[PDB]
Amino acid sequence: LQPLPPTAFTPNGTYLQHLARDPTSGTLYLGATNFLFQLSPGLQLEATVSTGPVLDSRDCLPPVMPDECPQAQPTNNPNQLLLVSPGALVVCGSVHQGVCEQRRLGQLEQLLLRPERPGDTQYVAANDPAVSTVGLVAQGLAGEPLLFVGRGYTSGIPPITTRALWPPDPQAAFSYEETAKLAVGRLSEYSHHFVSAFARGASAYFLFLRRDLQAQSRAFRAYVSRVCLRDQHYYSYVELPLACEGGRYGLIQAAAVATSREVAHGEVLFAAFSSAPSAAAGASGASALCAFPLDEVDRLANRTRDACYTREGRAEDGTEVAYIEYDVNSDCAQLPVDTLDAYPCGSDHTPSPMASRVPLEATPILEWPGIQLTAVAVTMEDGHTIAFLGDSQGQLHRVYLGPGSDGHPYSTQSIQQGSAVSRDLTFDGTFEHLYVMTQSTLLKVPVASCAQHLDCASCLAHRDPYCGWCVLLGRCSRRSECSQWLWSFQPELGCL
């Protein structure tokens, strides 16, 4: 049982698509239809920017000119990508073939970088609001910021590109070089659908669905793929199928690593999956949370790279575990063991792009029927890992993932009934609030509300791992506030 959120932001006359937090300042940036918003941590506006609508047509290339593109009409610009970078906000709409721009952090109304005459290596985001775009900011071997972009197919732009944010010639911004791409023949048939991008260590990782054209089924399947964070070709690119309860929950929806004061980015990816590209809606559907240690992702990908480079795609027992994907003219090789160290990210003579026949397997930490999860955040309190999970019906569930749990949520709260929770769920600086976003509103939700129980008995009855009874203070609180504390989740003592 949870109170009404204390703070809301709701834009008049528009829908929300993305949220980005600047951790230096805590400033929130909101990408909406025809809008960009800059918000204080208390969800008060600092800046509003109009991004639309614009004269446009998907059959025309920008600049869109009336006398030159007669069928262009005003076109609404829902936001496709919103990312904080070392010196700029990166902004991509769906209008004008997905071109991007860069704006000043803390002064959103100030344009910093925008190519005036973009070419066809600078069409970044999906120019269809139905289709999803994901990105990742990272640094190249020289410190130059790079934009990794995961772009689903629109009714021929590489599904994954590595684009330069600060090229020395400013007119080249957001373009990828010839080889800084995943070259895929049949885009429309693979039909990538991207869910998230994240960096860890020396690699960039993508989570997506795509048809398994290699197998007989040609079914949509979940993948994690990994590429060297500075290999500005895709020599190191390797794909792994993702199995949650062996593929019963086939469609990956959202994912996050643990984030808290104790660790800014944990080592365990918590992915939400749904049974089946959309999940079954209503009672028929079911969702699962599967945890994958990133070190397991890296071992399977390593083994896959090692088999393809040095054993013609074979595991040590002679079984066929790695192959070349996307119909690219390339084969697994028997290169000298030497090349594993020489070329950790590959070269122009190493097999590419690689994939595993062997999936990464995980057992659900929760199976929930009739719930379609759409959003995952994970944090830690007094050492306990807690998951915050949003669903398609606008519900936020809080879940204890520690030992002894059975996967039931210890709290469910209605946020905006019927409106999917955005996967751009993220915490504030102190991990005291969750920023929950739907298509309609941005709410600032306190991770717990122990103070609402004024008596020991009610404090302990309403079980919540954040909360316990502080005897000397006589309050219901988090442990950290209790300057003897009876944990409501498992109380050492009673009130008498």
Partner 1 sequence: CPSFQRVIETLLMDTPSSYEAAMELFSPDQDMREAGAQLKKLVDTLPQKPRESIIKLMEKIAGWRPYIERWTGRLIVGSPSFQRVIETLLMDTPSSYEAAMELFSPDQDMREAGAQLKKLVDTLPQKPRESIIKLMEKIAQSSLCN
Ligand X SMILES: *[C@@H]1O[C@H](CO)[C@@H](O)[C@H](O)[C@H]1NC(C)=O
Residue 355 CB coordination number (10 Å): 23
Q: Which of 41, 44, 106 is nearest to 427 (CA)?
A: 41
Letters for 268-307 (x = contact with partner 1 by CB under 8 A, - = none) are x----------------------x-x---------x----
Are 431 and 447 within 8 A, CB to CB?
yes
365 in contact with partner 1 (CB under 8 A): yes
Cβ density class 187-196: b for 16+ within 10 Å, e for less? beebbbbbbb
Task: Tell the smallest beta-carbon distance from residue 354 to ligand X (Å).
Answer: 13
Q: Which of 117, 194, 182 is nearest to 154 (CA)?
A: 194
Nearer to ligand X, 295 or 327 (CB): 295
Stretch binding partner 1 (CB under 8 A), from 118-126, 137-145, 199-207, 260-268: 260-268
Question: Taking CB within 5 to 8 Å according to partner kind, which of partner 1, ligand X, none is near residue 266?
Answer: partner 1
Q: Which of 315, 340, 471, 482 binds partner 1 (CB under 8 A)?
A: 315
Nearer to ligand X, 92 or 228 (CB): 228
Are 290 and 363 within 8 A, CB to CB?
yes
Are 197 and 205 within 8 A, CB to CB?
yes
- Put the strands of the sheet holding 176-181 in their side by side order: 133-139, 145-151, 160-164, 176-181
241 in contact with partner 1 (CB under 8 A): no
Dihedral angle over CA of 336, 337, 338, 342, nearest 10: 110
Q: Which of 25, 217, 363, 484 binds partner 1 (CB under 8 A)?
A: 363
Question: Taking CB within 5 to 8 Å according to partner kind, which of ligand X, partner 1, none is near residue 118?
Answer: none
Nearer to partner 1, 46 or 245 (CB): 245
Task: Tell the smallest beta-carbon distance from residue 297 to ligand X (Å).
Answer: 8
The residues in 250-309 that bind ligand X, with binding defined as CB under 6 A, are: 295, 298-299, 302
Pairing between strand 238-244 and 360-362? parallel
Count the site residues for ligand X by CB under 6 A: 5
CA distances from 430 to 241, 427, 433 (A): 36, 8, 8
Count the site residues for partner 1 by CB under 8 A: 30
Nearer to ligand X, 332 or 421 (CB): 332
403 in contact with partner 1 (CB under 8 A): yes
Distance CA 69, CA 64 (A): 6
Q: Which of 83, 114, 94 is nearest to 33 (CA)?
A: 94
Nearer to partner 1, 277 or 293 (CB): 293
Nearer to partner 1, 263 or 495 (CB): 263
Nearer to partner 1, 201 or 403 (CB): 403
Question: Taking CB within 5 to 8 Å according to partner kind, which of partner 1, ligand X, none is near residue 402?
Answer: partner 1
Nearer to partner 1, 88 or 258 (CB): 258
The residues in 96-155 that bind partner 1, with binding defined as CB under 8 A, are: none
230 in contact with ligand X (CB under 6 A): no
Residue 493 CB coordination number (10 Å): 13
Are 53 and 74 within 8 A, CB to CB?
yes
454 in contact with partner 1 (CB under 8 A): no
340 in contact with partner 1 (CB under 8 A): no
344 in contact with ligand X (CB under 6 A): yes
Stretch binding partner 1 (CB under 8 A), from 21-29, 43-51, 116-124, 401-409: 401-409
Nearer to ligand X, 34 or 304 (CB): 304
Q: Which of 364, 390, 409, 468 binds partner 1 (CB under 8 A)?
A: 364
Tokens encoding 367 = 């199976």
Nearer to ligand X, 251 or 291 (CB): 291
Residues in touch with ligand X (CB under 6 A):
295, 298-299, 302, 344
Residues in touch with partner 1 (CB under 8 A):
243, 245-246, 258, 263, 266-268, 291, 293, 303, 315-317, 358, 361-365, 380, 383-385, 401-406
